[PDB]
Amino acid sequence: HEKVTIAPLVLLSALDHYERTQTKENKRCVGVILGDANSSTIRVTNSFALPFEEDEKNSDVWFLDHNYIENMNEMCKKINAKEKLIGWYHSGPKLRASDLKINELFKKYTQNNPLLLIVDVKQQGVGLPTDAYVAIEEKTFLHLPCTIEAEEAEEIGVEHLLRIRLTNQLKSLKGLQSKLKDVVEYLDKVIHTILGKLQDVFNLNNLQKALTVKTNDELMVIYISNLVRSIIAFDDLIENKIQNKKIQEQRVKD
């Protein structure tokens, strides 16, 4: 569907919000997110703290004002027209039924169904400390995957930060970790049919056929250059370097 761009600026700021707000896990610092949502890839330009109150002692009890967004967008629009409201964020890390109320408030203010944003203010788990949800509805809400863009100007300052293969595997466990547990969770949580829906694609393995072995067929030619890869290495430098040395070492006139 509309799965979205992610703005580090947002992400950072939202955490400084979290920081600034002195928010603890008792709370989730919330606020507007900005972008333009029309495309099958929504973009997140920006995002804004909505000064807020959250109480899960009584869930539906919590406080927020729109008049921010009122005053906000005006300036924001005046700042940039592309800022048009795409949705909103919060801290998280995880959902609370208070959300849905919060959710639909923005539906007043959004073109499409507005966007939740989970953050992990502790940035703990994985790729993203983040989720973004959109109500669907029997309610639905849903996370489409998202990611960062360039934002190179960001990436440039980002370049001032940091400083091939393996990781690709490294999630090998993750879902599989919780997964069977997740079963045994629900298994011994209730001790749904979706799970059985998950099931049949398990057989989708031990599948391997001679069809497999055709791999090496391919893998054969794959290796042809392995010499040639280094054959030119196998050729040039120290030939010439010796020459160059023979030049240089014989240079040595006076």
């Binding site: 393996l166 090998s172 970790q177 069977l180 099931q199 398990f202 031990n206």
Partner: protein, 190 residues
């Protein structure tokens, strides 16, 4: 849709759910097999009268014996006799689904054909139709080896149950996983 709301009456409740349970029959279907019978249409529907049938039909939705029911048949059900085809449609599919769901587990497909198809205890020359028909059953995939008398099959079979492959699941999938880490040691790291 009514599921959340709308208090009703039983004569509204069952009789609809009857007609529903009936329209299961005048469905019949892409089977189905199992259904909303789980949901509180049951006791509620069955009980008795044609619900007995409607329940016994759920039995035939499993048992699939004609004369456990073609016994039972009065007008209303014989009113559409095509269930006599549908129960064959059942029996096959009913046999099939578990024959499909389990019997091969070991990357299930073959089931091919005849004795396996007569293992539906519906005979071989009807197999030459019923088993022969696939999405001419509305459903089955795969194909026929006439000579070797082999069904080629593919999916278009959904299914259920629990407890079993549950453990198996993570095992292999943590198996490579763990073992990978051996290879998965230094590569892009180093």
């Amino acid at each position: 849709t009514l599921e959340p709301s709308t208090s009703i009456t039983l004569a509204e409740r069952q009789q609809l759910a009857y007609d529903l349970s009936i329209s299961a029959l005048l469905g019949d279907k892409i089977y189905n097999f199992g259904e909303l019978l789980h949901h509180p249409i049951m006791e509620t529907i069955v009980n008795d009268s044609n619900y007995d049938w409607l329940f016994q039909l759920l039995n035939a939705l499993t048992v699939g014996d004609f004369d456990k029911f073609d016994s039972l048949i009065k007008v209303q059900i014989s009113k559409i006799p095509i269930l006599a085809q549908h129960e064959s449609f059942l029996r096959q599919k009913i046999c099939l689904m578990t024959l499909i769901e389990t019997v091969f587990v070991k990357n299930i497909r073959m089931l091919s054909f005849e004795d396996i198809s007569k293992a539906t205890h519906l005979p071989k020359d009807n197999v030459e139709h019923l088993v022969m028909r696939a999405i001419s059953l509305g459903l089955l995939k795969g194909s026929i080896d006439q000579v070797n008398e082999l069904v080629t099959i593919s999916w278009v079979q959904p299914r259920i149950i629990s407890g079993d492959q549950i453990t198996k699941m993570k095992d292999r999938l943590v198996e490579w996983n763990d073992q990978v880490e051996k290879l998965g040691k230094k590569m892009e790291a180093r």
